Amino acid sequence: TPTPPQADEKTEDCLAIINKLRSDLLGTLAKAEDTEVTESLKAIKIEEPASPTAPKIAVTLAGSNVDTCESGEGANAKKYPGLVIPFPHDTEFNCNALIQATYTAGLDHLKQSNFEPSTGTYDVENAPFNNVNASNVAFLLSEKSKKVSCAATKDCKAGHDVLFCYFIDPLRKEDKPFTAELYNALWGL
């Protein structure tokens, strides 16, 4: 019977880079506590793993065997809405580097997309938000985001560890992730 990977809370390691990227069109985010994440998930009918939190979801996404973490590389937000970044088991965790890289790649993917802010909705199964980086940028830059809880698996012996950040309130299918004003400002940068 396999031993699962373990996850550490990473909110304090990640909140500086998240709030740097959001910054007067977006509010800063505060830390979400576990209770808040569990209740936010319960409101969108997500109750497994029991009393779900960012650490428990990072583990769920990486896999149930620390010897393989065989699902980490393919992890995404198709079920658990939030930022998802797999990283190799043999690398040092750097939240600044990981989130900056998803931001640059995801904003490039959106710019390359026929996505328009007036018509474009969030759908993790269709372009452009079926790209995990583009999905990650939608959560990072969401006007619905007020709080965040981040966690990462720390001890995968193979495969990819996973960073997961849960935003309250989550983007959901058919939300318009950006106003025209914010989307125009992202081109300005």
Numbering used by the authors: 54 to 76, 81 to 246
Task: Show the paper's wording.
In addition, a further 20 regions of the E. tenella genome were identified as encoding sag pseudogenes. These EtSAGs comprise a cysteine-rich ectodomain of ~300 residues, including an N-terminal signal sequence and a site at the C-terminus for a glycosylphosphatidylinositol (GPI) anchor for membrane attachment.
The structure of E. tenella SAG19 was solved by sulphur-SAD to 1.32 Å to reveal that the protein adopts an αβα sandwich fold, and providing an experimental three-dimensional model for the protein. EtSAG19 comprises a four-stranded, anti-parallel, β-sheet surrounded by six α-helices with an additional 310 helix and 12 loops, 10 of which connect regions of regular secondary structure together with two additional loops to the N- and C-terminus. The loop regions in EtSAG19 are extensive and account for ~50% of the entire structure with some of the loops being large with, for example, 20 residues in the loop between helix III and strand B (L5). As predicted, given its cysteine content, EtSAG19 contains three disulphide bonds, SS1 (connecting C67 and C152), SS2 (connecting C126 and C213) and SS3 (connecting C207 and C222). The structure also contains three cis peptides, two of which involve proline (E105-P106 in loop L4 that links helix II to helix III and, A184-P185 in loop L7 leading to the 310 helix, helix V’).
